[PDB]
Amino acid sequence: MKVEIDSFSGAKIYPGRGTLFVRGDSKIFRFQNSKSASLFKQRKNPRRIAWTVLFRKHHKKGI
């Protein structure tokens, strides 16, 4: 199997878990759950959502 990464939060996606979304510009996004999927549809920036891997990488948290 392959373990994919969340396109919004960077969480690990196990097989059969979450959803996938193909945008009209032929780019693939993978969501681990409806929470990150709905935040993506609400167009929030993952750099400003405090629990995401990209936020913690930006803010040097836990280093």
Partner 1 sequence: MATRTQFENSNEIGVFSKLTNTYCLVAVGGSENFYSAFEAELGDAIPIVHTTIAGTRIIGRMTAGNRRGLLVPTQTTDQELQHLRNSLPDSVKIQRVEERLSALGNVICCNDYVALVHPDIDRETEELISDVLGVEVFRQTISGNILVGSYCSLSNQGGLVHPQTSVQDQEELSSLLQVPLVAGTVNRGSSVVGAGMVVNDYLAVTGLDTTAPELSVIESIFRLQ
Partner 2 sequence: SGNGAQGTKFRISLGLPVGAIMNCADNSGARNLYIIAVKGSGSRLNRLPAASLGDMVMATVKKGKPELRKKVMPAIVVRQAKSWRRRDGVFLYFEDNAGVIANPKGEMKGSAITGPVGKECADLWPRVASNSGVVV
Partner 3 sequence: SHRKYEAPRHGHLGFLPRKRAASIRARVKAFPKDDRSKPVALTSFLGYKAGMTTIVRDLDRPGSKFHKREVVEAVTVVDTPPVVVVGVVGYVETPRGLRSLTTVWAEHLSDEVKRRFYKNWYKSKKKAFTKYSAKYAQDGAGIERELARIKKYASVVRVLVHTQIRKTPLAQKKAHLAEIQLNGGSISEKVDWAREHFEKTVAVDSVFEQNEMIDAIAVTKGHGFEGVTHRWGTKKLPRKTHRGLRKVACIGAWHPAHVMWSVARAGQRGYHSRTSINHKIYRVGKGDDEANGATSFDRTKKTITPMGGFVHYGEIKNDFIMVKGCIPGNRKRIVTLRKSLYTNTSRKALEEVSLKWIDTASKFGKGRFQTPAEKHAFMGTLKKDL
Partner RNA sequence: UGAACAGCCUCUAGUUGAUAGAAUAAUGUAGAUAAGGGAAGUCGGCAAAAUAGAUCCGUAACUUCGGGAUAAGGAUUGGC
Partner RNA sequence: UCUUAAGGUAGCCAAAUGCCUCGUCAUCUAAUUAGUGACGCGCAUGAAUGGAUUAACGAGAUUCCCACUGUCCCUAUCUAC
Partner RNA sequence: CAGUCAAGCGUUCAUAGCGACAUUGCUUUUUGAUUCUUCGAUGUCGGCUCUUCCUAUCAUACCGAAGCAGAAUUCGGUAAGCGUUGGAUUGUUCACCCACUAAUAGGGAACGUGAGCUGGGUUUAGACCGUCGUGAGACAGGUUAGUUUUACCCUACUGAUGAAUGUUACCGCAAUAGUAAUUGAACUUAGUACGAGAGGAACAGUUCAUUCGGAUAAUUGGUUUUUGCGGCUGUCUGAUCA
Partner RNA sequence: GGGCGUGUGGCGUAGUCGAGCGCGCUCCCUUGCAUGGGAGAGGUCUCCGGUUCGAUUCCGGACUCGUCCGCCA
Instruction: Considering the complex, state which of residue 14 and residue 21 has its C-beta at the smaller distance from partner 3.
Output: 14
Helices (H), 1-63: 34-41, 53-58
Instruction: Considering the complex, state which of residue 5 and residue 20 has its C-beta at the smaller distance from partner 2.
Output: 20
Quick check: 15 binds partner 3 (CB under 8 A)? yes
Segment 3 to 32, residues that bind partner 1, using CB under 8 A: 25-27
6 — phi, psi (to 5°)? -65, 130
Task: Give the residues lining the site for partner 2 (CB under 8 A).
Answer: 15-16, 18-24, 26, 28
CB atoms within 10 A of CB 11: 20
